[PDB]
Amino acid sequence: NPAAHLTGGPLLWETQLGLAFLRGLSYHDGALVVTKAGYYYIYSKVQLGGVASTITHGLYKRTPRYPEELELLVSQQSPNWFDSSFLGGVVHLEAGEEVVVRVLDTRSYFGAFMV
Amino acid sequence: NPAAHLTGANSSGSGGPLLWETQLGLAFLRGLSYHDGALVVTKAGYYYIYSKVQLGASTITHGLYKRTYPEELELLVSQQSPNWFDSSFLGGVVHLEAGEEVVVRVLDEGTRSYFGAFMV
Amino acid sequence: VNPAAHLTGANSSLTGSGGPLLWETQLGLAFLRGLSYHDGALVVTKAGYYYIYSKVQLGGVGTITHGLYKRTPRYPEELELLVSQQSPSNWFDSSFLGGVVHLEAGEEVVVRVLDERLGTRSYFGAFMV
């Protein structure tokens, strides 16, 4: 029932409008913040294009008590020209917990929904 | 309740809106309809939608498109540039009204290709 | 509990075994909730529609099929559910599959990769919808 889609340091996103929405989840500084604890399916798609040739696209759990981010779902990819990266998966999130998208070195998005 | 998984059928330009199997094998429709390539919503609300397209400048586009207004609103799209094979997957939660339709297109226009949705 | 599971960290079954990828089921981000696990398979307890998914992290040195397959009683052959063919000096590539399938009590789903090489980089999960 809680859910969020969000559209194109951690990455940053539009949280309204049109396709962007928050619904039972907060936001601050690129991150989805969880209010109701449970299992969420979290996902992110990132469009890439260019001209280690190796890009990493990840979802990370941040907890304010701790600096260090914990990896959740992570993809590595090498490559006139376009590549798209998608990650999805289910994670147990407690109230408080935040999730961000990072990509190391419009079309893209970031989202979740409780399952 | 509402959910569907549709699997690739033999189309068919224009873009074009891919056509789908709704009943044989793994395909099914449960609380959603289908009309000429389109999943059609019946119960308003937030749906996770997805499509996977098996591909087989030289640049392919894969997208999920809403109809309501006139015209087609891009919902989710990827570009890629691949004896070759590649696969393109898109998913995400979008709000849909009873009456809205969702379709799939790929440029330079599949059996391991599919299209589906469920209410979230 | 709405049945669900997330399994992590693929590795291959014993060479010559014929078996599928094996996964971590308890530690870290891995859990099983209202599904069971047996030698690589998620085993369905409660019949219905599930969104099943798997991501596999690929990479080598110089065609790969990543699939989710169903095992059903008295059917010697694994049935395809969702499959992807990809074809990529070191390289890296990731393959994601997701989709809603109907599964009966007693049915099993496994993940395979052809050919297998190949925590957070590889995974296999599901939830009832």
Side-chain angles (χ1 to χ4, degrees), chain A residues 4 27 40 48 86 108:
Chain A
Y27 175 103
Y40 290 73
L48 307 168
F86 189 92
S108 301

Side-chain angles (χ1 to χ4, degrees), chain A residues 65-83:
Chain A
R65 185 193 331 201
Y66 323 69
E68 61 186 304
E69 284 169 10
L70 213 201
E71 278 181 355
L72 297 169
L73 315 171
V74 178
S75 172
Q76 290 167 234
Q77 230 146 315
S78 45
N80 208 337
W81 51 259
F82 300 106
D83 201 24

Side-chain angles (χ1 to χ4, degrees), chain C residues 8-69:
Chain C
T8 65
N11 75 115
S12 295
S13 293
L14 274 282
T15 180
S17 73
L21 303 179
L22 308 172
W23 305 89
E24 166 57 49
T25 60
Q26 294 181 119
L27 299 181
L29 307 158
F31 64 92
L32 274 179
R33 282 193 163 241
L35 284 146
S36 295
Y37 178 79
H38 192 248
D39 235 332
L42 286 164
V43 183
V44 177
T45 339
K46 173 186 195 178
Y49 290 88
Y50 289 74
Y51 179 87
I52 63 175
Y53 62 88
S54 176
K55 213 269 264 175
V56 127
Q57 180 62 57
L58 307 172
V61 276
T63 299
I64 291 146
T65 303
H66 171 215
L68 284 147
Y69 300 89

Side-chain angles (χ1 to χ4, degrees), chain A residues 100-112:
Chain A
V100 306
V101 183
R102 305 180 155 287
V103 48
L104 317 189
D105 206 6
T106 319
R107 288 282 162 81
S108 301
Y109 49 83
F110 173 33

Side-chain angles (χ1 to χ4, degrees), chain A residues 1-64:
Chain A
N1 155 57
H5 185 75
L6 305 180
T7 196
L11 302 217
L12 302 168
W13 314 88
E14 195 56 84
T15 93
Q16 355 184 148
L17 155 143
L19 298 200
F21 66 94
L22 298 150
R23 177 164 138 274
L25 293 156
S26 324
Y27 175 103
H28 79 253
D29 293 40
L32 279 164
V33 174
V34 177
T35 14
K36 195 160 152 233
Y39 293 88
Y40 290 73
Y41 180 79
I42 61 163
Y43 67 93
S44 161
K45 198 277 264 169
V46 138
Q47 179 68 63
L48 307 168
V51 301
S53 313
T54 257
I55 313 173
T56 293
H57 167 215
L59 287 154
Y60 302 79
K61 188 183 91 172
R62 192 213 282 144
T63 293

Side-chain angles (χ1 to χ4, degrees), chain B residues 1-5 26 28 30 48 50 52 54-55 83-87 89 112 114 117-119, chain C residues 49 51 63 65 70 80-88 93 96-102 127 129:
Chain B
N1 247 299
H5 185 83
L26 295 173
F28 71 97
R30 150 154 155 278
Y48 181 78
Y50 63 85
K52 206 271 275 166
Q54 174 67 62
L55 311 174
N83 310 102
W84 61 271
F85 294 94
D86 198 24
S87 184
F89 187 97
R112 271 84 164 282
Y114 52 79
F118 57 96
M119 190 173 106
Chain C
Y49 290 88
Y51 179 87
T63 299
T65 303
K70 172 168 81 188
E80 305 193 343
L81 300 170
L82 314 171
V83 173
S84 153
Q85 302 176 247
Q86 230 143 311
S87 63
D93 197 17
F96 187 86
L97 303 153
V100 183
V101 300
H102 182 83
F127 54 91
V129 166

Side-chain angles (χ1 to χ4, degrees), chain B residues 7-8 13 18-19 35 38-43 52 62 70 76-77 81 91 96 104-107 120:
Chain B
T7 63
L18 314 198
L19 289 202
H35 208 272
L39 267 173
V40 179
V41 171
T42 274
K43 194 196 170 182
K52 206 271 275 166
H62 172 217
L76 325 164
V77 191
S81 42
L96 305 165
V104 177
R105 308 167 167 289
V106 39
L107 307 191
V120 146

